[PDB]
């Protein structure tokens, strides 16, 4: 069951280097061409580069906008494909996906992606505050709780509740950029009695700072 997985993203300067890693499994890796497609907010989906088979001398093909700066390599023995990126620039900002060169003539399977941000701005782990009722009468489904994530940079941060075990009625708004910093909030609605007799916690992750934040809403 095809599963591709990218990694190695974060914040770079205008103009540093960074290497992406992709690990595929669930198919004879050596039998397929591998791809790299980035998705910028400003330029949608953009094919970056491709690498072919061994019988192909491991031929590579790059997108005009990255010829010379990016280099795609592979390791059939490890079922991995890499993307060395040098001389990065604002324009290279975007989510990078590692896809397979399908037998059908189309990038059939994609990874979840790994974000890359080029900027002179520096990292800032997020600050997480609790969203607790505010002492009131029960008249709104049955108990809404949340975590407010502020002052972080870059993007993104992923919020999960109870390590992902709690996944029903979770609502996470979109992040907004303000004062050079992002923020958002995630909320979940639980039954009036499952809380606080039972513990609820949000799991805020911020790849760029490599930090994972765990906080539990008690009913203060």
């Amino acid at each position: 069951e095809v599963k591709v997985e990218e990694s190695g993203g974060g914040l770079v300067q205008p103009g540093g280097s960074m290497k992406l890693s992709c690990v595929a499994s669930g198919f004879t890796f050596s039998n397929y061409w591998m791809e790299w497609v980035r998705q910028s907010p400003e330029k949608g989906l953009e094919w970056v580069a491709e690498i072919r088979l061994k019988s192909n001398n491991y031929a590579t093909h790059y997108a005009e906008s990255v010829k010379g700066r990016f280099t795609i390599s592979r390791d059939d023995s490890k079922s991995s494909v890499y993307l060395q990126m040098n001389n990065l620039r604002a324009e290279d900002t975007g989510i990078y996906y590692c896809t397979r060169g399908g037998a059908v003539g189309a990038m059939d399977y994609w990874g979840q992606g790994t974000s890359v941000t080029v900027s002179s701005a520096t990292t800032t782990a997020p600050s997480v505050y609790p969203l607790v009722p505010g002492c009131s009468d029960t008249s709104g489904s049955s108990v809404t709780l949340g975590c407010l994530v502020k002052g972080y940079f870059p993007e993104p941060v992923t919020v999960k509740w109870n390590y992902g075990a709690l996944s029903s009625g979770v609502r996470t708004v979109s992040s907004v950029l303000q004062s050079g910093f992002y923020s958002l909030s995630s909320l979940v609605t639980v039954p009036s009695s499952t809380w606080p007799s039972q513990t609820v916690i949000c799991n805020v992750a911020h790849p760029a700072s490599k930090v994972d934040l765990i906080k539990e809403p008690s009913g203060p």
């Binding site: 949608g44 989906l45 003539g105 990038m107 994609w110 505050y129 809404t144 708004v173 909030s185």
Partner: protein, 215 residues
């Protein structure tokens, strides 16, 4: 390169109804080997894109018969009869006949019956005070359509400065949106007032939904 333009940009459709997305290329996609490499993909909210149709009309593994692909010269189309909840997301058309390029995308939105928001208001956490600012949040849950008006009232007087509204995507299960209005004051500003109200005004009600708290 080869440009792929998709229309419409945004598309509302009732459940069970039909929908047609078109994709036009700047040039002929017919490959020398007589194959037209035109594909369509679906990217659900917060997910990697997925292959639906390959080579104009072939459906990929696990794709329902609901998805159909046709083509004629440089104009191509994706059809979705019996549209449903899980079909919401952005649809792309791509071509690999030449240097791979993708289409701008089309946001399929599920048109459903109006839903009344469920307001909740959270006062700032003492944990935030040391940052020098206080954020009061008003959460509008499970409502349809998207549109909504939130107004804040501090000690009666309507306030506009310091507000930030942000929406969620359409929900895959029930097709409703959620939205939070955040009011951020400075530590002291917030301590010079006591009654904080927010009034929500939706299509589903003449009288604003009002939620409030006092310190």
């Amino acid at each position: 390169d080869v440009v792929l333009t998709q229309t419409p940009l945004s598309l509302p459709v009732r459940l069970g109804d039909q929908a047609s997305i078109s994709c036009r290329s700047s040039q002929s996609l017919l490959h020398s080997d007589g194959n037209t490499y035109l594909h369509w993909y679906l990217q659900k909210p917060g997910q990697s894109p997925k292959l639906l149709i390959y080579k104009v009309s072939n459906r990929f593994s696990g794709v329902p018969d609901r998805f159909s692909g046709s083509g004629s010269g440089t104009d191509f189309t994706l059809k979705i009869s019996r549209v449903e909840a899980e079909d919401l997301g952005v649809y792309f058309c791509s071509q690999t006949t030449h240097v791979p390029t993708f289409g701008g995308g089309t946001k399929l939105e599920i048109k459903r019956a109006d839903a009344a928001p469920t307001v909740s208001i959270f006062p700032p956490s003492s944990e935030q005070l040391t940052s020098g600012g206080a954020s009061v949040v008003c959460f509008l849950n499970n409502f349809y359509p998207k549109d909504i008006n939130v107004k804040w009232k501090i000690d009666g007087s309507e306030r506009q400065n310091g507000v930030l509204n942000s929406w969620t995507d359409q929900d895959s299960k029930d097709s409703t949106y959620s939205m939070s209005s955040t009011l951020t004051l400075t530590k002291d500003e917030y301590e010079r007032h006591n009654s904080y109200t927010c009034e929500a005004t939706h299509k589903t009600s003449t009288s604003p939904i009002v939620k409030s708290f006092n310190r």
